């Protein structure tokens, strides 16, 4: 589909039977979801942005469905004020910016 | 890796 | 143009005869630029992102050329780690997300 930007581009994503709302963010290299338990090993990581850095947990090969699209990749979990879908996954669903 | 989410 | 997301969507913008590199960021409501001087009166403002809140300076009605397309709107200036073009200006140049 074609998503306009009059409002925040929030969409529905499916993770392990969990359905959540996420922000399509071209300004994020990675995907950062709010606190949630995921199976598997994870490496500690520090990610930054406006304001500074926060510590998150990195999980790999996590299956995620975005608007009926299947995607699998790295997912960072930490105290994020909002769920963020980054470029690592956006490229997988063929998402582009157009004007 | 930088996450540039920004809220008004 | 159509922009893919395998790399950061950085583009060149022209603001006040100055050329700068900025990130097309659908995950930002506003446009925030690194410290620089702009004409006109500005008001102090606080904005937030991943690592918390920061203080910025708000300039209104500033003309900004993004890859040739003209926009005129609010530009916030402050300690952002990277120049970002937010939705306030992206909507003005007709930018959409597509997949």
From Swiss-Prot, chains A, C:
Superkingdom field: Viruses
Species annotation: Human immunodeficiency virus type 1 group M subtype B (isolate ARV2/SF2) (HIV-1)
Free-text function comment from the UniProt entry: Aspartyl protease that mediates proteolytic cleavages of Gag and Gag-Pol polyproteins during or shortly after the release of the virion from the plasma membrane. Cleavages take place as an ordered, step-wise cascade to yield mature proteins. This process is called maturation. Displays maximal activity during the budding process just prior to particle release from the cell. Also cleaves Nef and Vif, probably concomitantly with viral structural proteins on maturation of virus particles. Hydrolyzes host EIF4GI and PABP1 in order to shut off the capped cellular mRNA translation.
Subunit structure: Homodimer, whose active site consists of two apposed aspartic acid residues.
Region spans: Dimerization of protease: 1-5, 49-55, 88-99
Active-site residues (renumbered): 25
Gene assigned in the entry: gag-pol
Lineage: Viruses, Riboviria, Pararnavirae, Artverviricota, Revtraviricetes
Domain Peptidase A2 as annotated: residue spans: 20-89
Shown residues in whole-protein numbering: 491 to 589 of 1437
Signal peptide as annotated in the record: none
Protein name per UniProt: Protease
Swiss-Prot record, chain B:
Cleavage (site feature) positions: 4-5
Signal peptide as annotated in the record: none
Anything else known: HIV-1 lineages are divided in three main groups, M (for Major), O (for Outlier), and N (for New, or Non-M, Non-O). The vast majority of strains found worldwide belong to the group M. Group O seems to be endemic to and largely confined to Cameroon and neighboring countries in West Central Africa, where these viruses represent a small minority of HIV-1 strains. The group N is represented by a limited number of isolates from Cameroonian persons. The group M is further subdivided in 9 clades or subtypes (A to D, F to H, J and K).
Protein name stated in the entry: Gag-Pol polyprotein
Organism: Human immunodeficiency virus type 1 group M subtype B (isolate JRCSF) (HIV-1)
Gene that encodes it: gag-pol
Stretch of the intact protein here: 374 to 381 of 1439
């Amino acid at each position: 589909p074609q998503i306009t930007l009059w409002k925040r581009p929030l969409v529905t994503i499916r993770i392990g039977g969990q359905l959540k709302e996420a922000l399509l963010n071209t300004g994020a290299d990675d995907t950062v979801l709010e606190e949630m338990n995921l199976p598997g090993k994870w490496k500690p990581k520090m990610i930054g942005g406006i304001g500074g850095f926060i510590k998150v947990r990195q999980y790999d090969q996590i299956p995620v469905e975005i608007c009926g699209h299947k995607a699998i990749g790295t997912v960072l979990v930490g105290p994020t004020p909002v769920n963020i879908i980054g470029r690592n996954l956006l490229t997988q669903i063929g998402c582009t910016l157009n004007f | 890796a930088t996450i540039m989410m920004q809220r008004g």
